[model samples]
Target: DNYIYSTEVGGVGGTPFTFTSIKFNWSDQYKLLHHIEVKFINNANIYATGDPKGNHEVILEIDDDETIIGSVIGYKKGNDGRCTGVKLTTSKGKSIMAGYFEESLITTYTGKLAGIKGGAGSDIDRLGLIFLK
Candidate 1:
């Protein structure tokens, strides 16, 4: 069975900004199959970061114990990979990591992964989804 994690935004309060790309780590282990899921809310206040062309994005990175397995890009709008949600399993039979971002031309990212967790039989690897915008 799959479970869902929810995150709440404390209202957009900051300088407006724009972004282009974002990078993040999703998994960090060896030969472990993991999954990724994302959820986003389009808040108008998110554009109050002093910039007007601010767009949302989601990026992911997968690590296989000591090696980086692969990565993927996603976005909310404005081309470049507009994606609201994603689910991917490591094909290399390896562990992985996933990250979310609000891509802009200047600061690159404005937001981060809302929530994250591991599946059954896995320890509570909560830190795997933590990041800085």
Candidate 2:
């Protein structure tokens, strides 16, 4: 297989797609991860999950020189363990992180992160990693 799904967070949600860039948003009030959106290499299609609103935003572009290989997510205490932060590592060994990684506790997941999957309402309730085989 060329792609595999290794779900570390939610075992439920959508299938993955080839992407060019990823964007993360954090809740304005609670400072948790509110939304995740990815830009497609396929004719302007954009896929997004989680909440519709988050005041702070960050963008990570998968440049021609590097690719995203793995990730880590930090969790906060309330709202059924809200996703408060994320750290995405690249093939070049650099990390692009967002939100508050120290506000609470966390768990780590590492794989050939090729895409994103999860469940959400007002905030991201679950997260999973898509691997490249």
Candidate 3:
């Protein structure tokens, strides 16, 4: 059955950076979000929707450990509705976010939030989840 959907955006400063690649893991054993990164495909200089700014990347590190639990994704929806930022929560209730955090929605997975699969091309374009089956 189908159980997912998405929306669109406005702008980012003036220029926007479309997503290109993703640096993620989902095997379960290595549980360390450590930090989140914001990089540019061509980069940015503007508003909430798109927060990229050049070829370099900036990371917001989370300094603690409790084994990764869940994530809190929030963004302004830059360009064709791409997320410009992200966040993560640990089993200890500690969390940290990087870049823009807006558009704001909430959901809690009752099952094990195990595995991730999404086509990350020029953007996380649209991300989907995989639960315990």
Candidate 4:
């Protein structure tokens, strides 16, 4: 079975943010697939779609904080290509160091797999989520 992870993030200056979901599946490009979706409340929603070794970026507007953001890099395991690394960043200078996954579980700078938390640091903002399959 596949899993979906979601979380909310607290933005600087009261701007709220969220990491909506992370999905794992098979992509046409390879034996592994992964995608990330994020939303800036009252602004824009950004999504990155690609395989385990792809890179992409999307623009986000957060109530005047128009920022260009997306995923930078990704890594996978063996031929099946399980998720290994996924990095995200924003033009507003925010970022998420979402680590790898094991047995369909992921760990971020703040929260764990499919977990939520309040914004306490500058890197993750408010919320985070990790999905496994």
What overall lDDT goes with each candidate model? 0.25, 0.66, 0.35, 0.35
Task: State, as a TM-score between 0 and 1, how close model 4 is to the true structure.
Answer: 0.28
List candidate 1 segments past 4 Å from native. 1-65, 79-83, 86-92, 95-133
In TM-score terms, candidate 2 sits at 0.73
TM-scores across all candidates? 0.18, 0.73, 0.40, 0.28
Per-residue lDDT of 51 in model 4: 27
In model 4, which range of ten residues has the least summed lDDT? 116-125
RMSD of 3: 12.3
Please provide, for model 2 over 1-133, each residue's C-alpha lDDT reduced to its tens digit, 9 standing for 90 to 100. 5776654453233332233688888865787787888875554777887765877888877765476666677765443566678888888877778777665543444454567766666777666567655
lDDT score for residue 93 of model 1 = 44
Clashes of each: 21, 0, 4, 4
Candidate 4 — what's its lDDT? 0.35
**Model 3: per-residue lDDT, tens digit, 2-103?**
332222222222332222112332111221121223332344421122222223333322332334467654433434443444455656575555444446
TM-score computed on alpha carbons, candidate 3: 0.40
Between candidates 1 and 3, the one scoring higher on TM-score is 3
- Kindly list the per-residue Cα lDDT of model 1 for residues 6-123, writing each as its tens digit: 2211112222122211232222222111222333344222211111121322343433222222323222333122222223334344433333434411111112333333221121
| Residue runs of model 4 more than 4 Å from their true location after superposition | 1-65, 77-79, 101-133
